[PDB]
């Protein structure tokens, strides 16, 4: 009766494209159409590679049959909406595997697991997977697979204002992030054939479940400047990141998944453009349901008077901008030395920001000449 | 005395300390010590007042005829007084001779690691070292008063028990305080006998070979009553010599009554301040002992006993100044202690922190500053995007009407690499001042170099408005330091423009080519002036629309207001 | 020199500074200045060392024969040195003469409002006031270094532009720095001509009527290179007089090259410290100019030019001391600034705050202290509930065996109003020390009066254990201040008990009736010693079972552990 | 169909006993048996008096028919358990009406409502109802009526450890306090005949609902020392309680309801003794269900080896003790001058604490003589 699995566990039609997975501009939308998009099993397939790559299938003895059984049941729960669907969950999963298993210029490494490739030869090139035990990372990878699970398609401010049953239930405090963690964990304990975490202790499964919930709840944006303020207070005046501390290792994974959640305007201009049509396509739907009730349509959520460029320029300067400055002043962004340091991720942010300032200039200047 | 010079075209507090001699060799061979002391103390009061209330400039008429300052210097008694109030002199003072005047440009005192909030010429809280009474300097009087406030008084250890120690011949400081305790109760003293004790932190001995001895006790006593009362209490014996040979002074009866009246008079005049529930008084007791040679009275000896106090005891009021409106005053004893004991608020909410933590500016670009944002990115047709017209609705309505204003504002911002001007219907009421209605609007250009300018526009061909713009530039310079926390040197220039219908010209006044400043006043930082301007407006509760950071995106996320006790 | 006296029965660091004259009149008429200076500097090094490493006592053999201290005092050159290191002397020093010795009981330096962490006899970081080079005191060198660390260097404003100022004849300090810039490049100087400038914060002038002039430059130069480099840089001209009449010195050739070698030798020996990325060196340049009278060379004039630096520059190493294990050493320049630049951690979690927040103790009962709790409320059968036997499981197993121990512990706690003794299998390893296995157990009684005692029990009739207990009482006394933060005076007494089977007697040693202390050391506070003991054990990571606060109730309500980076 | 109301709204058999309601030792258990305990309508009856007393029925125009309709539906939801039942909710409601509407020696008063009696004549006797607007107090009174609503009878640590469906739902973070606020508010919006807050704005009902939820969540004990530490940081070194601030007025109602929630060992010895048999009677039930599953029985929850005195002495010294010290050092406890200041509430705490130390002494000493 329950969703169990597809018959062949690990498909192989999608080979020669998982090989170019160690690159920041992973062609996610080409792997989608590559897979039969009628059903959708990308999340379980991208997850099996990144878990096989890290080597967590042996360090914890995770039965592969029950593993794929779960993650296939996970992706079926992700609704069919324009942005917060099973493709966004695969992009946020990949982005945390990249940020934690790639060379960081000037990182002092110290149960651990390093990436399959990693080409470990330098002493100035550390990776975050060598500063965090494998338990904290498998929690961070499972927290990213199920972090928008069963998304209604609306934002928190909409559920709160309209008094949705999910908002009265969770008391108007992280109405969605509490729902993704509850509804996803509740599906895990539902059947016995999902328990891929069978060879764990009682104290491990308690610490594992704690880190998974504390990461799915850091992807809330109402608590954005609280995290960014806390993170700068521990890299500016403190002794730095104390990789022996467990609160500091937690705050570094709460930023690593915060940055991976909003990582659209840090990829190539073609990838960032596809996502942006995704999110506003979701907003316009909310404006439809918001106007059919009598409530004034929200800013940026009016498909008749769109402001797609105004929204993306406020987002990059207000939200994504100051978050990468914090994650970069702490010396954690993966880059490369210049024989001073090159950053591919920060460069796309600068290029994409300037791209929208043209669209706003030519749209105000042109508009000004018409209306005199 | 010291009067605020209100007849100057500086946008700053100018004090006119009178006439002052100057030069190393001129001050040295000056044959009037009482004058040279009075001139030095007059330039020290002025320099202390300007440090406490924004900044300013001290103007002193050169007294000696031929003075150069390029071959004569300043002095040496002056240089010491400057260096006692300030740790680092070149960070606060700039010296400049302008024809027949000597000017000193004082920066504003700013909170530093020392924890001091105001400067003081002398605390006048004495303390008792091993043998001598000295005055508490700034950092000692701060740590002496912060402990008293913490324990709501002062914790003494009254003799609840004599400690059960071994029995061994040992000499300590209580041996001197004990011997003097029995010399005190002695009814008669034999002339030219020996003392069994010397002076220590509980005993003082004064010779005072004086004929009057009353004009001498009037000015040396209250600093010894303050020393003893501020630490452990003690005794003070008057009428001995240096060889510890008791002599006394040749005093006849009916003068000891006046003396005891003068002693109790001066001691009840000394200020005090209690951090405790009760309000005691300075407990003590005087006494006179005969020094009968063998059968005749040779003189007398005054013995004074001061018991340890519960709170502070001043020899005089705290010698700290400030200029209130004009006619610089002296800080009262209640105001002085509230600066040395209390803190500042320092709220700095989480959103407000990231607005300022952007300013770390390591040796890297570190883009995305949040205090330089704006929705409308199109003003000044021929240009790039380098000026932020901040209110964005007052700046728009003001440009619709006043057809000459927009083209004048854009022709004015031509020579600026990067800045941000902030309009306002009146910048005087924004700084808590009186408004005049003849002024059309205002502005404040904060560029990289070229210190902040204050444009005052108006269309009335009757006035000049030199008093409005200058007084508002003055108040803005003080709020930026005393409230905004800007820790470098600032001058606020001024321009006044006439804006009759059909015309954008007639710059009525330009304060930049009217007053000369030191070299360092012409270079600002422009990221700490926006930070400083932000906090000054917030503390004044005048933060409405400057620093846009539009909240159409915040409302979609659900984030709350910027900061207040309003939600 | 200064050696740690290891032949004393004090539970403290004793330094033996050698022989020292004493008394006001004795030190005054002492006919050897070089001796009196060396004795004063020896008692100042010792007093600085003890302030930095816990506390201690300075022992100095009286040199003059008939000294009393009750009719002779201490001296005045000594009292000044004491009062320069310490703000308030009576809070730190106690003086006592014990037969043929003079003892000074030094408290431990504690963090106060000033923000200083260690004491210094001299920073040796000079600064330049208006005309004279002076040394940065403790609070100036703290604020000069905390800024350099903050900006990762020092922000100068190299001439990016000359400020567009009005055109008016004005005289400033750059006029002197400009005239000296052209005197520097002058190839020849006419004998007995006039200077167009005087000395200011960029120019120094030295006469130096010396025959050698090289043993003089060796000791006066590095404090002027440090003054200029630490503020704005400047010039130093050697070979003038006081009347500004250029003369020079009678220097023959073949000596200027030695001079230039000595000048460059002394300047490359001066210590420096960089807060920046690159590591520059002290840039400068010397020069020699002839003073040809009319056609003959009359002498020479050495012109030195020091450019402004990017970081600190010392004239010598920082003159701050500390006693490491024995044989008191001088703090290296890398450790000295690390005290002057960095902070303490100060974690103090939310649960930990309320464990100490009980200690406000206003004039009211304010009951319910959390550091004095225990489940078992029944030991010592004849008594009330006034002693907390803390570990509660080590204190139970130790009482099961050792049948004489329990009755001895209860017979010992009879004369205590209220206290708390804390057992341990060994109190030496708890303080990070070496353990000896002959010691049965230990204890620590912390009562209201009667300073903390350290009982050492053992059953071996061969040793005495005076070295174990005394060294552990010493280490516990320093951690209570340097780590626990106790800010008053402490002494840790000691008792050693022999505990053979069938008998609880034979107190082998009792340190209380063996050493005499000052009066104030016999009274503690007992709520700040538990607070201090709590933090010392936490910083040492030895906090296991003392301070019970049983977690059977906490587990019912899900409250977490006390504090660590373990959850 | 739904629970609507009893036919006569305000009963009057329970008169001459509501008159002695302005006293700290309110005989709650005598008003219980006075009312017909077969059904249970004490909470709606004690609420109508305290609301009529304060004068909130006119300051907000609260329809009495819909008011009593709600609160009767509220008390029926309170389960029938030994401690957390509809009687405990009436005791916590009364205790906050007392603490906020009684003379405080040395309180500087400044829409407000004072108690019906209050005998306002002094200038040294202020009451908290004159420092807090009526909206913040009606929220504090409605937050106390519904703060243990639908209590399962188990503690948070039990729901979390046994993985109860309420713990997976709320992510093991305030599993019970989130449930009382959600399940109570969800019943309010259920029917239209419960909306007694009809004459309120949209911004008022948003601020009202916020304060009600922020008070029901402060009655969690896992966050005890966080509040007590925060409250001492604002009365010790700050400028004191700033009654013009809205965060400070909130923190004073979060302590006022925290203290009123645990107020057992601050009443007379007869009242405090009845409650204590209540709470341990609840613990023993949990030990039964906890032993029938295999889990080790919790401390103090073993009805065969009871430690009723050990529990109450740890509670008063660890939890209730340091909370009244904080609420007393801030000068807010209602007392009386001594012609120095008398405190009835703090005196019962001292008397009751000494009462259990006898029971522990005579139980260890006696036990010691038996076991040698
Ligand atoms: C309400 C969600 N929203 C925050 C303002 C949002 C807007 C835009 C994007 C967005 N913009 N550009 C892109 O390229 C794709 C995503 C990151 C994501 C979010 N979000 O929080 O998920
Ligand atoms: C688990 C609930 N618990 C905290 C330890 C608790 C114990 C005892 C009492 C209690 N003890 N004594 C009494 O008189 C009645 C109540 C206040 C109340 C609670 N509680 O949190 O509600
Ligand atoms: Mg989400
Ligand atoms: Mg997401
Ligand atoms: Mg509850
Ligand atoms: Mg309750
Ligand atoms: Zn007093
Ligand atoms: Zn350097």
Coordinates of N, CA and C and ligand atoms in Angstrom, one line a residue, chain A residues 84 88 147-148 151 176-177 180 216 219-220 261, ligand 3:
Chain A
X84 N 8.8 25.8 -4.9 CA 9.1 25.0 -3.8 C 8.7 23.5 -4.1
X88 N 13.8 22.1 -6.3 CA 14.4 23.0 -5.4 C 15.1 22.3 -4.2
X147 N 13.3 20.0 3.7 CA 13.2 21.3 4.3 C 12.1 22.2 3.7
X148 N 11.5 21.8 2.6 CA 10.3 22.4 2.1 C 9.2 21.4 1.8
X151 N 5.0 21.7 0.8 CA 4.9 23.2 0.8 C 3.5 23.6 0.3
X176 N 5.6 27.5 8.7 CA 6.0 26.6 7.6 C 7.1 25.7 8.0
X177 N 8.2 26.3 8.6 CA 9.3 25.5 8.9 C 9.0 24.4 10.0
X180 N 7.3 21.6 7.9 CA 8.1 20.7 7.0 C 8.9 19.7 7.9
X216 N 16.4 22.7 9.7 CA 15.2 22.9 8.9 C 14.5 24.2 9.4
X219 N 16.2 27.8 8.1 CA 15.8 28.3 6.7 C 14.6 29.2 6.7
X220 N 14.2 29.8 7.9 CA 13.2 30.8 8.0 C 13.8 32.1 7.8
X261 N 20.0 27.6 0.9 CA 18.5 27.8 0.6 C 18.3 28.9 -0.4
Ligands
LIG3 MG1 11.3 27.1 3.2

